[PDB]
């Protein structure tokens with residue numbers, strides 16, 4: 001099994017939320033979202049880091065405007081998606097729908113699945 005040093009840490013979850021709040025490229029879209037779509041954003045920041053997610057300007061813009069389909073289509077074109085497509089497809093469904101369909105849940109259990 002995984003080393004204890006390599007497991008999911010609640011504090012790293014909290015670091016992702018802090019990172020969102022203190023980045024003007026992230027907090028406005030987070031604030032605009034419902035709780036389930038917020039979990040998708042937390043996941044993405046947890047995985048690739050604050051700076052990286054803040055680079056997704058076009059797609060976050062779409063999310064902030066409730067343009068769910070356009071956001072999902074755009075996110076699936078990224079290098080991120082092609083790197084980790086199973087995970088990205090789950091996160092994208094969560095952004096698109098505001099449901100846990102892709103995990104059938106809460107942010108911790110979502111990450112517990114995605115981190116493996």
Ligand SMILES: [Cl-]
Nearest residue numbers: 084085086087
């Ligand atoms: Cl994957």
